[model samples]
Target: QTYCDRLVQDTPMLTGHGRLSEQQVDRIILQLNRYYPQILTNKEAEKFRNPKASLRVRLCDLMSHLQRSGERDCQEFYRALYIHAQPLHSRLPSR
Candidate 1:
């Protein structure tokens, strides 16, 4: 599947049952900034850093920004974020 497609599919998992808490989203963004600074521009990072913004809103904005920029590399970045955010209870069962 395309990165965008994967992002859409995996988002529910990222947010857990309801929505992602600001702290949760912040951690994901921080990880991205630390490991892949180029994935998000400074302005984009600032948007995520805003405590007043809801996690869901920030996430949507980031996705839209990346989509508009047509950054294929963001696919991997999103995948890494998904993996990083997964809780143990949400992991797939052993085969």
Candidate 2:
């Protein structure tokens, strides 16, 4: 029902879903671990670190987890993305 909703719902170009570069994914995850570990724990994020994991699946799981966590938790996720996933951040609402 808001920016977070749109972000999680949109596909392809907006959030760089299936085509995200490994480096970009790594950067986003690193930011989450570095700054928002309380919202998204290092242990929780470790699943995304596996080289064999599907980027789409990992990101999907992360998004759902944040959505369930609460509003501020989602902001931390967006903030992490803002720092590391700039181009994608541009697509997000500037709340």
Candidate 3:
């Protein structure tokens, strides 16, 4: 479970992180949904866009969602983050 926990622990690093913006967020979510069609529900991914929440709260929700969805999804998220979110790849949760 170390890998899993590292994902959770590392998730916070992206929130309010430098260079992460709505554009990057959109790219990440877009790639995520495109790559793994069911990874995020229609409704959940929508919030990240219209979020009254901070970018912080937005990806905190993202992390929580991924955390519960099981390891395989977490793996997909790592790929999405690595490929689409260049600044966050250093969070060190990647495979």
Give residue 53's lDDT in candidate 1 (0 to 100): 68
lDDT of 3: 0.71
Score each candidate by Cα lDDT.
Answer: 0.59, 0.66, 0.71
The candidate that achieves the highest TM-score relative to the unseen native structure: 3
Worst 10 residues of 1 by lDDT: 86-95
Tens-place lDDT per residue, model 3, 24-55, is 88777876676545687667678766657677
Badly placed stretches (over 4 Å) of model 1 are: 9-17, 88-95
Which portions of model 2 show Cα errors greater than 4 Å? 1-19, 93-95
> Scored by Cα lDDT, where does model 2 land?
0.66
What would the TM-score be for candidate 2 when compared with the true structure?
0.72
lDDT digits (tens) for residues 14-53 of candidate 1: 4453545666667667666666446665676787789786
Greater-TM-score candidate between 1 and 2: 2
Itemize residue pairs with steric clashes in candidate 2.
none
RMSD in angstroms, candidate 3?
2.5
What order do candidates take by TM-score, descending?
Answer: 3, 2, 1
Worst 10 residues of 3 by lDDT: 86-95
